[PDB]
Amino acid sequence: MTVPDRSEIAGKWYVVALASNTEFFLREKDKMKMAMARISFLGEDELKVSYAVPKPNGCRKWETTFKKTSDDGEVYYSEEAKKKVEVLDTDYKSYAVIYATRVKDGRTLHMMRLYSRSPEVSPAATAIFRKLAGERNYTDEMVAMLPRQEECTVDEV
Numbered sequence: 061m062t063v064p065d066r067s068e069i070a071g072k073w074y075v076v077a078l079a080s081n082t083e084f085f086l087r088e089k090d091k092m093k094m095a096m097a098r099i100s101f102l103g104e105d106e107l108k109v110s111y112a113v114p115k116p117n118g119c120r121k122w123e124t125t126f127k128k129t130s131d132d133g134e135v136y137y138s139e140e141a142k143k144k145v146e147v148l149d150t151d152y153k154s155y156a157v158i159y160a161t162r163v164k165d166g167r168t169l170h171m172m173r174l175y176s177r178s179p180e181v182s183p184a185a186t187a188i189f190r191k192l193a194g195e196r197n198y199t200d201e202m203v204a205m206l207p208r209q210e211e212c213t214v215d216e217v
């Protein structure tokens with residue numbers, strides 16, 4: 061409540077560019093199109109967020125809950141989904157950059173994701189985005205920009 065900005069962007073979050081090094085995912089992120097999502101505040105230490113990705117091979121839409129989210133200041137952690145996301149940069153004015161990391165048994169992973177407040181991409185959104193990726197010594201092929209092309213979409217259900 062003390063952050064009306066959240067309510068402003070909450071309801072629809074767009075993913076239009078990512079960064080990674082794991083070929084399996086990087087290999088595929090390069091083929092998908094822009095994705096959408098909806099986030100809700102359950103509690104500062106818990107929030108509900110949904111993922112919407114249009115996959116021509118088979119669109120996939122679902123919901124997910126984030127629990128025990130207060131570790132490093134404001135970060136989300138799902139004991140079940142063994143995956144956490146920390147607000148690495150968010151303005152909802154034109155873009156937001158977040159640090160996403162998935163850790164499997166014996167394997168750890170990190171990746172950056174660039175969001176857009178509007179289906180369009182601001183040259184600055186891609187640049188600030190690249191700046192961070194560079195700090196991680198990333199290369200173009202490691203970061204793939206995604207178009208607005210849409211085949212499937214989610215509802216305000």
Ligand SMILES: O=C(N[C@H]1COC(=O)[C@@H](NC(=O)c2cccc(O)c2O)COC(=O)[C@@H](NC(=O)c2cccc(O)c2O)COC1=O)c1cccc(O)c1O
Pocket residue numbers: 075084085088089092095111113124141143160161162169171
């Ligand atoms: O390493 C990560 N994925 C793997 C492994 O995850 C998976 O294979 C599946 N996935 C989940 O079950 C999942 C369950 C719970 C939460 C999930 O996000 C799942 O994805 C399906 O996702 C996909 O096929 C693709 N995925 C998106 O397009 C996406 C688009 C926008 C937003 C997405 O989350 C997407 O996954 C590719 O994802 C992958 O290859 C990975 C890391 C860090 C953060 C991630 O989100 C990752 O997914």
Ligand SMILES: CCCCC/C=C\C/C=C\C/C=C\C/C=C\CCCC(=O)O
Pocket residue numbers: 066073075096097098099109110111112145146147148150156157158160173
């Ligand atoms: C918003 C989560 C969307 C989840 C589904 C889409 C992509 C999954 C990967 C990263 C998205 C996770 C969080 C979005 C970034 C910052 C949230 C700030 C919330 C706030 O400022 O209070």
Ligand SMILES: [Ga+3]
Pocket residue numbers: none
């Ligand atoms: Ga995922």
